[PDB]
Ligand binder design. Structure first.
Ligand code: G2F
Ligand code: ZN
Length: 472
């Protein structure tokens, strides 16, 4: 049967199913309603940065249509909606004056969600640093971000926390550090060879450290000031793709484990254990910032749940570790990616080149977190796949590969949960086709099709799949 035996009965009691978007990717009204620019507005408005020179000025216009979209997610039997608050829509300069029209939008959205029985899961940050803070403070290179972020978080907790009980601070700090400061392909476009400046061997580590300190500071403020009255929770969202040793050799197993540690351990070791992974300490040495004991104790235990963004898997091949002149965070791992074993590809690719369809990667990742980190509460906060540009409406709607994707991945998640993994929810990326960063509108991740000429929504087969699977 097309559900492949899946339904709410196949998951734990009260398990949460939702869809996910982010502010810049769906809201539109980027320079309206009092919103100040983010680093992504500046980046996307620069010729050549995004496919087609596209930007999120209008995006899906969820700003005007949010009741349509909430009605749609309710009709598809979802329980929750993960979305983000645009920092520069609340504080156009990142600090100081509040944009009340921006506050009113999120109040209206939250209140409508609650009216329709959809639980809001709210991210405070999703790549969209206020441009004013990048320019004034140097963004995530500056430890002062902990204070600036905490003050923004405090405002959001005070303003929305009587209603919002499920928060996340950040989305994928690894990707900000990697793309923004190692490879230099996302804002602020910093890297060793980059026009904006930078250093791919040091800045990714500074940036990751400042995300951890800022998360920890925001959660401390929540706990000491808001939690008693509001009784909510705050987590963080981290990407984790699976790494599988190419062979059972000691060097290949070591390589796969090094990749896990540099990918997810970079954040989870501090959040669970109060220190960076030993391998990172050993290889990155002086380029890896050191937490003071007090900072370590602030960071450890600071996530009430861990959001995991899971898409894909790779094989890893290793050799003996060697002394090498530092060049980049990426090179520090001393691993070799391989996308075939025994002459067979690990999986077929979706539209995005990095996205190999490998459902057992979901089991791999969830099992590994369960076994390595004492089975923390995990929420799968992003999972999905994309179609390419230029298809007809009907071709978008007949998204049979995405239907297969969700059925297979959710089956593998169910396998991990049935084996005891403490997974509390699952969120499909994305409710809607949207602005896919450097791909612009050329990558379609939605379970609902969006016609980017007319802005019309049309649910795809995968939307009806969810509606059927999730019926109460
Ligand atoms: C997770 O991945 C999707 C697909 O690349 C992005 O659109 C989201 O912003 C990111 F959070
Ligand atoms: Zn509009």
């Amino acid at each position: 049967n097309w559900l492949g035996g899946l339904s709410r009965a196949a998951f734990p009691k009260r398990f949460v199913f939702g869809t996910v978007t982010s502010a810049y990717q769906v809201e539109g009204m980027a320079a309206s309603g009092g919103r100040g620019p983010s680093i992504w507005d500046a980046f996307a408005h620069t010729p050549g940065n995004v496919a087609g020179n596209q930007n999120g000025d209008v995006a899906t216009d969820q700003y005007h249509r949010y009741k349509e979209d909430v009605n749609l997610m309710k009709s598809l039997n979802f329980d929750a909606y993960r979305f983000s608050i645009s920092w520069s829509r609340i504080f156009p300069d990142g600090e100081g004056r509040v944009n009340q029209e921006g506050v009113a939008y999120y109040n209206n959205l939250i209140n409508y969600l609650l009216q329709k029985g959809i639980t809001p899961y709210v991210n405070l940050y999703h790549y969209d640093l206020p441009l004013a803070l990048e320019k004034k403070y140097g963004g995530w290179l500056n430890a002062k971000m902990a204070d600036l972020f905490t003050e923004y978080a405090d405002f959001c907790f005070k303003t929305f926390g009587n209603r919002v009980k499920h928060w996340f601070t950040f989305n994928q700090p690894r990707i900000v550090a990697l793309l923004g400061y190692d490879q230099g392909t996302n804002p602020p476009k910093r890297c060793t060879k980059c026009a904006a400046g930078g250093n791919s061997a040091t800045e990714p580590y500074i940036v990751a450290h400042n995300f951890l300190l800022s998360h920890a500071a925001a959660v401390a403020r929540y706990r000491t000031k808001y939690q008693a009255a509001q009784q909510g929770k705050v987590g963080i969202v981290l990407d984790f793709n699976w790494y599988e040793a190419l062979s059972n050799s000691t060097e290949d197993q070591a390589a796969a484990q090094r990749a896990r540690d540099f990918h997810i351990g970079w954040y989870l070791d501090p959040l669970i254990n109060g220190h960076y992974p030993q391998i990172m300490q050993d290889l990155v040495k002086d380029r890896l910032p050191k937490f003071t004991p007090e900072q370590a104790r602030l960071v450890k235990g600071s996530a009430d749940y861990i959001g995991i963004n899971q898409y894909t898997a790779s094989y890893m091949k290793g050799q003996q570790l060697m002394q090498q002149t530092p060049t980049s965070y990426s090179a520090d791992w001393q691993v070799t990616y391989v996308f075939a074993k025994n002459g067979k590809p690990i999986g077929p690719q979706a539209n995005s080149n990095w996205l190999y369809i490998v459902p057992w990667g979901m089991y791999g990742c969830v099992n590994y977190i369960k076994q390595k980190y004492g089975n923390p509460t995990v929420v799968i906060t992003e999972n999905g796949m994309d179609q390419p540009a230029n298809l007809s409406r009907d071709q978008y709607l007949r998204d049979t590969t995405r239907v297969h994707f969700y059925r297979s991945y959710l089956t593998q998640l169910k396998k991990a949960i049935d084996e005891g993994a403490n997974v509390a929810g699952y969120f499909a990326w994305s409710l809607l086709d949207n602005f896919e960063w450097l791909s612009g509108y050329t990558s379609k991740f939605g379970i609902v099709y969006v016609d980017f000429n007319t802005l019309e929504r049309h649910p795809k087969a995968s939307a009806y799949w969810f509606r059927d699977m999730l019926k109460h």
